[PDB]
RNA sequence: GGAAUUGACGG
């Protein structure tokens, strides 16, 4: 790259920093600057400095000039896409195309641009899929072909609180282009495919494509056998063995997670019987495979599978908790309630797992609230609490699922929570995971007198709870579950902290929802409007 | 206006 080229693209850069150029002129200058890339797309897109300017250009130009860049650069796009700087240039071009998805006049121009990209990729895909930079480009490209434009963690595919809450049960796009690109990424030998399964970056690409094909059963039934190398759907014994042995690999385990999530019923049933049945517990103790088990459990379809999973895993609930595999337990509990099978057996197995003697069953709640401290401590027969400590996220999610059961199945849990001394209860409410347990109990079908007993034990702390951003929710839910007598006590306690409360983010909504000002000025009128509630 | 598993990701 000669100095006139660098000086030119730098000077274009400085010209945009000096915001003396309206958007109208700006998008013209962007398109004109793209012409200075013709014949040297690779050199400029991979330049560690000028790549950043070229990103600015692709995101600020108009659809016609963007499409010309994608067409002119297409024979070198795979090289650009696999470069540490060029990959962000390639991704800028896709993000820019994606801004036009909502425009129906743009459909055929975009499709043509994707076609020239997909054609060069499909011609030689395997190194691009496995390249650390190129894998990100493919992920975005697959998303664009599907018509999604907004990056989502799950699609790329990170963990997210929304997916956990789903796992724990708490635009048309360019379809022919998606199918054509994906078929190109899959038309390799069974022996190549065996190693795509275990390469981090290719696994990530296939995870995205699988997720994008959710509920496209005719396609999923074509692509999943290719990924699993078992080309009616049937897994032969030798292939099932190879799948089972690769299940502890970190890359393949993530891929099988997604496969279980999108698998149509007949495909799921075959994987259940031919791969996982009889190995559930061994896979549940592996640091990678247990998450595959977590996904298997979540998408179980019928009570017969629920029986098989309960036999292999419930006797080992204590082992799973000790070895840091509470997610497996959480999933089994959660799906029993979804399938309406083995509900009582699951709750009773969890109690027995945490409380071996009969004496210790009154402590089921504190021990699940601090799952890791209790199973970690030197002497478990004296562990009572973990003062000051952050409570255990998955133990609290377990409890949140527990309280969605009918009260018939969870009497040990209700008794244990409603028995905790006042200081422990308010400690739970001040904890951002523990408050979700309390709110789950308040929403459960446990008796009102039992709810009222726990709420009464929070008296004297509603002011401080209201100051917590998480605890303030608990205050409303306590309030809504109360008689007039306790609605007034709570309202009175938010009164003493009204100045501080109104500062905080939630305060204004809390004060309004509870009508705290009306209580302070017209207490009789406040009381009579609540007794009507 | 709220915590988000124990195992991956970029000039």
From Swiss-Prot:
This protein's UniProt keywords: Nucleus, Repeat, RNA-binding, Translation regulation
One GO cellular component term: nucleolus
Protein name: Pumilio homolog 23
Gene name of this polypeptide: APUM23
PUM-HD domain sequence ranges: 222-533
Domain remarks in the Swiss-Prot or TrEMBL record: The pumilio repeats mediate the association with RNA by packing together to form a right-handed superhelix that approximates a half donut. The number as well as the specific sequence of the repeats determine the specificity for target mRNAs.
The Pumilio repeat ranges on this chain: 36-71, 72-111, 119-157, 184-225, 238-273, 274-311, 419-456, 457-492
Keyword Cell division: no
Molecular function, one GO term: RNA binding
Function: Sequence-specific RNA-binding protein that regulates translation and mRNA stability by binding the 3'-UTR of target mRNAs.
GO biological-process terms attached to the record: regulation of translation; response to glucose; response to sucrose
Signal sequence segment: none
Compartments reported by the entry: Nucleus, Nucleolus
Range of the intact protein held here: 88 to 640 of 753
Domain of life, per lineage: Eukaryota
Lineage, top ranks: Eukaryota, Viridiplantae, Streptophyta, Embryophyta, Tracheophyta
């Amino acid at each position: 790259i000669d100095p006139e080229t660098s000086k030119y693209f730098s000077e274009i850069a400085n010209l945009f920093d000096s915001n003396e150029v309206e958007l109208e002129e700006r998008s013209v200058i962007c398109g004109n600057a793209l012409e200075e890339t013709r014949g040297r797309e690779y050199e400029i897109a991979t330049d560690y400095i000028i790549s950043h300017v070229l990103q600015t250009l692709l995101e600020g130009c108009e659809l016609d000039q963007l499409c010309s860049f994608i067409r002119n650069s297409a024979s070198v796009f795979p090289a650009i896409a696999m470069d540490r700087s060029g990959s962000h240039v390639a991704e800028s071009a896709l993000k820019s195309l994606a801004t036009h998805l909502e425009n129906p006049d743009a459909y055929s121009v975009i499709e043509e641009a994707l076609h020239s990209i997909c054609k060069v990729i499909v011609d030689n895909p395997l190194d691009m899929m496995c390249n650390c930079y190129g894998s990100h480009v493919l992920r975005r490209l697959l998303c664009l072909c599907k018509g999604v434009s907004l990056d989502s963690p799950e699609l790329y595919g990170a963990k997210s609180s929304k997916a956990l809450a789903k796992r724990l049960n708490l635009h048309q796009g360019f379809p022919g282009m998606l199918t054509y690109l994906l078929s190109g990424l899959l038309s390799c030998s069974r022996e190549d495919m065996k190693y795509l399964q275990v390469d981090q970056y290719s696994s990530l690409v296939l995870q995205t494509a699988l997720r994008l094909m959710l509920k496209q059963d005719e396609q999923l039934l074509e692509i999943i056998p290719l990924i699993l190398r078992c080309n009616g759907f049937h897994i032969e014994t030798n292939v099932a063995k190879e799948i089972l042995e690769s299940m502890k690999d970190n890359s393949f385990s993530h891929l099988v997670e997604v496969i279980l999530e999108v698998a149509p019923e007949s495909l799921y049933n075959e994987m259940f019987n031919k791969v996982f049945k009889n190995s559930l517990f061994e896979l549940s103790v592996d640091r990678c495979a247990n998450f595959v088990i977590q996904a298997l459990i979540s998408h179980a379809r019928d009570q017969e599978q629920m029986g098989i999973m309960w036999e292999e895993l419930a006797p080992r609930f204590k082992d799973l908790l000790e070895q840091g595999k509470s997610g497996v337990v959480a999933s089994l509990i959660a799906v029993s309630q979804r399938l309406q099978s083995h509900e009582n057996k699951c709750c009773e197995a969890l109690v027995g797992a945490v409380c071996s003697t009969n004496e210790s069953r009154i402590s089921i709640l504190p021990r699940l609230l601090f799952l890791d401290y209790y199973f970690g401590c030197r002497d478990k027969s004296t562990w009572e609490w973990a003062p000051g400590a952050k409570m255990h996220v998955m133990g609290c999610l377990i409890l949140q699922g527990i309280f969605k059961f009918s009260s018939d199945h969870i009497q040990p849990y209700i008794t244990s929570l409603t028995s905790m001394k006042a200081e422990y209860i308010t400690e739970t409410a001040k904890d951002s995971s523990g408050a979700r347990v309390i709110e789950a109990f308040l929403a459960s079908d446990a008796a009102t007198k039992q709810k009222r007993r726990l709420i009464i034990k929070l008296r004297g702390h509603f002011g401080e709870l209201s100051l917590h951003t998480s605890g303030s929710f608990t205050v409303e839910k306590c309030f809504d579950a109360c008689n007039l007598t306790l609605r007034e006590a709570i309202a009175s306690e938010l009164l003493d902290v009204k100045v501080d409360l109104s500062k905080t983010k939630q305060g204004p909504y809390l004060l309004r929802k509870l009508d705290i000002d009306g209580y302070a000025s017209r207490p009789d009128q406040w009381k009579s409007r609540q007794e009507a509630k």
